[PDB]
Design a protein around this ligand. Structure first.
Ligand SMILES: Nc1ncnc2c1c(Oc1cccc(Cl)c1)nn2CC1CCNCC1
Ligand SMILES: [Ca+2]
Length: 453
């Protein structure tokens, strides 16, 4: 009954999350800022009925814990769901960890106590996460003492997971084996936390592989070891907790509540404690790899979307061109730009007609010839993905060599799920005399060829 766009105005894009885009919105009356997740009904299938989702939303809005994202409102229209809640500005936990100079078991214990405290509270209220991963751990604010906030508790119960690799990066490392076979309960979140803890103390995923399916095979077998040099400096109580959290049979696995009472959490959140330097280095490399694979898939996705929309907007304006002089008025360009989103679905950044008019005004200030309007309007859509790709390449290239080796390409394309023979074939066409490494432009050329260009 209540309309989302009548209450809130979209201010900035916050980024892509599970099931949808996240937008920084502001209440038009009170000035309250909020983070809004927009879920497209045509792209995301519902697992439950309308009344089951309404009942969970009503419960989720009443729950309150300092390590759980606060939900404020919920809206639904013909084609979307709008989940409105509190905005957190500290970024992803792992992006803050790689910025600091030192990281010890005290820092890892304080992180995991917060995550376990939030999970314990949500399990007492019969809510399961299922998709707990570092990307769902946000820091409340930019301060070094900020609490961790878990986002997306309870959503996996009501929305089906995306099958596209651009939406599944990192997910295979943390998923509990019982989730893969279909019988699972709240203990799956203890397993996921166990994996995160293993990565915080060693910087290496316990279940790894050269591609998504190889990771899932290791997860399904459930076997892992503490046979890496970096585990020698870690306490025995930490390894005991990980062992209890990564116990295969969920009825034998420790509960979130009992993981809080574990000796490791009690000792390290209240006796020599060195900095886990090799772990930080490995987390920094792991984070850079995941972000570059993700940036590569989103670059290819936005390039295909841009090609689709460039051609559709050209056809719309060509039909609207009454005399065929290649030119149109501002009012006509709004009509055609609105027509594009009416058929291709509403864009998260274009919440209502007023947002569409402002986007058209920004393009008209740079450039009337409708072909020029199309080019500038579509380059603005890809801007973020192109600069994210170059920035992620530069971050991955930690020695500033300007190049990425074939072994690094194999790792990146493995995480991106691009077949080995497919990317090597593309590399041969970009540079016929390739010498086992590519610069940024050659890498970008490879991605353009990997999406039909
Ligand atoms: N609370 C937040 N504050 C700031 N940004 C948020 C979020 C967030 O979690 C949401 C935001 C709105 C609704 C729901 Cl159900 C979850 N998702 N995002 C988007 C981020 C999530 C982490 N990677 C970058 C994009
Ligand atoms: Ca390099």
């Amino acid at each position: 009954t209540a309309i989302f766009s009548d209450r809130y105005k979209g201010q900035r894009v916050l980024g892509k999350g599970s099931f949808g885009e996240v937008i920084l919105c502001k209440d038009k009356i009170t000035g309250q800022e909020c983070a809004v997740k927009v879920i497209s009904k045509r792209q995301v299938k519902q697992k439950t009925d309308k009344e089951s989702l309404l009942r969970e939303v009503q419960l989720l809005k009443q729950l309150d814990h300092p390590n759980i994202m606060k939900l404020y409102e919920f809206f639904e229209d013909k084609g979307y769901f709008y989940l409105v809640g509190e905005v957190y500005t500290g970024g992803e936990l792992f992006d803050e960890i790689i910025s600091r100079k030192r990281f010890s078991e005290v820092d890892a214990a304080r992180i995991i106590r917060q995550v376990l405290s939030g999970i314990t509270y949500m399990h007492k209220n019969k809510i399961v996460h299922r998709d707990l991963k570092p990307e769902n751990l946000l820091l409340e604010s930019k301060s070094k003492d900020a609490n961790i906030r878990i986002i997306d508790f309870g959503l996996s119960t009501h929305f089906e997971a995306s099958k596209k690799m651009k939406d599944k990066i990192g997910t295979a490392y943390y998923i509990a084996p019982e989730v893969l076979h279909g019988t699972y309960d709240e203990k799956c979140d203890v397993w996921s936390t166990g994996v995160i803890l293993y990565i915080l103390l060693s910087g290496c995923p316990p279940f790894n592989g050269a591609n998504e399916y190889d990771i899932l095979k290791k997860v399904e077998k459930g076997k892992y070891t503490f046979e890496l040099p970096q585990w020698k400096k870690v306490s025995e109580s930490a390894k005991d907790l990980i062992r209890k959290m990564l116990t295969y049979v969920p009825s034998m696995r420790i509960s979130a509540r009992d993981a809080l009472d574990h000796e490791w959490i009690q000792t390290y959140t209240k006796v020599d404690v060195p900095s886990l330097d090799n772990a930080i280095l490995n987390i920094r490399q792991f984070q850079g790899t995941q972000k570059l694979a993700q940036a590569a898939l989103l670059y290819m996705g936005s390039k295909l979307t841009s090609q689709d929309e460039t051609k559709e907007l050209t056809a719309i304006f060509h039909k609207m061109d009454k005399n065929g002089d290649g030119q149109l008025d501002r009012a006509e360009l709004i009509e055609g730009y609105k027509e594009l989103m009416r058929m291709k679905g509403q864009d998260a950044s274009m919440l209502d007609a007023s947002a569409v008019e402002h986007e058209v005004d920004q393009v008209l200030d740079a450039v009337i010839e409708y072909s020029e309007f199309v080019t500038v309007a579509m380059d603005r859509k890809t801007l973020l993905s192109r600069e994210r790709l170059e920035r992620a390449f530069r971050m991955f290239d930690s020695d500033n060599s300007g190049k990425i080796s074939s072994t690094e390409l194999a790792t990146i394309f493995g995480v991106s799920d691009v077949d080995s023979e497919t990317w090597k074939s593309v590399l041969s066409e970009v540079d016929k005399n390739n010498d086992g490494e590519v610069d940024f432009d050659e890498f970008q050329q490879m991605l353009l060829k990997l999406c039909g260009n």
